[PDB]
Design a protein around this ligand. Structure first.
Ligand SMILES: C[n+]1cn([C@@H]2O[C@H](COP(=O)(O)OP(=O)(O)OP(=O)(O)O)[C@@H](O)[C@H]2O)c2cc(N)[nH]c(=O)c21
Lengths: 187, 13, 177, 12
């Protein structure tokens, strides 16, 4: 069985791509790349596609659980929020790709123990003003879920303890921007 | 339920 | 006598959009005459296939809630049943267009971004979008004039919903009139 | 520039 059966993932996942075409609406710029539910198929997908650090600025990858679209408006996201990692241009070179891979590994490997069920997906934004990586969770009011996820994610990324990351609710983000919206939680 | 640690997943690349 | 040959400029330049279940810019206009020429060449809302929208938005404001001028705003929402498709939809929509291009909300017309008619199998919608749902007096004044312009009796109540609430979710309304 | 509805409808 180990000799010939692929290793099943707890969840089936969908990888999405966003390209910044300024002539189309945000939603219209969203493209489904592929779905997978094994370790082997994940790697086949990962080895085939551009590293985030090689994407044109304005583009995104999203990895979301199958059945959850990578937008605030989805039922699984509307009450949720994101743990946000903000990177400068030096970090594009040194941290972006390794941080994004590690984030993928946390999702597909169900690394958040009990609270992995609260995870919806993750998004990497490649941007001239600073790249971002974020884990989206389902319920901003699940304080224990949100804190456990944040703390494990920070540890897995290997961020020095002194480096604080914030959690932003989507509702707040929707009426402001990523760098004007306030933190509901920190870790 | 189905949980994979980091070194296991990275073994498959 | 200039009224003989000069067109009647609108306060604003407006863009009419079509959306089906793709989003197309139909035309932009800025006079009374060009408004009617556009209105007379296009399908009445009641003759659209379910799933289509028209949107009239001030030029430079995209007919999407995420636009910087809509993200903090909301909409006054008129919901219609199938019987009202026949008796109310077209006249309510025209009246809405007239409210917008004629700047009928006095000092609070500045707060108007646009209007949308949604034609749907499960109930058509008309809505006036405004820029800032925390502008209480503006939203309230717009609401009251709009209701009286549509000839809705006092018994009937319309709600104002912020776009962020609609997108993100216990009442939908922050104002009613 | 404000136009009342009767004026606008006169163009229809
Ligand atoms: C995640 N997201 C982003 N957007 C739109 O895209 C705009 C850019 O957001 P985003 O790519 O996450 O972040 P950026 O660094 O490009 O710009 P920012 O200053 O607005 O943080 C955002 O302001 C919204 O207008 C969305 C619009 C939606 N209707 N639903 C979304 O989930 C959604």
């Amino acid at each position: 069985p180990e000799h010939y059966i692929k290793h099943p993932l707890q969840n089936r996942w969908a990888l999405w791509f966003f390209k910044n075409d300024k002539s189309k609406t945000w939603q219209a710029n969203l493209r489904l790349i592929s779905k997978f539910d094994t370790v082997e198929d994940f790697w086949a997908l990962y080895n085939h596609i551009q590293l985030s650090s090689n994407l044109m600025p304005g583009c995104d990858y999203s990895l979301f659980k199958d059945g959850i679209e990578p937008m605030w408006e989805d039922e699984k996201n509307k009450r949720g929020g994101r743990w946000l990692i903000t990177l400068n241009k030096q970090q594009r070179r040194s941290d972006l790709d390794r941080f994004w891979l590690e984030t993928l590994l946390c999702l597909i490997g169900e690394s958040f123990d009990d609270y992995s069920d609260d995870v919806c997906g993750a998004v990497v934004n490649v941007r001239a003003k600073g790249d971002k990586i974020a884990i989206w969770t389902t319920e901003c009011e699940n304080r224990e879920a949100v804190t456990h996820i944040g703390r494990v994610y920070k540890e897995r990324l290997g961020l020095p303890p002194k480096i604080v990351i914030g959690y932003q609710s989507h509702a707040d983000t929707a009426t402001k921007s990523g760098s004007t919206t306030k933190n509901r939680f920190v870790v | 339920k189905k949980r994979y640690d980091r070194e296991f997943l990275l073994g498959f690349q």
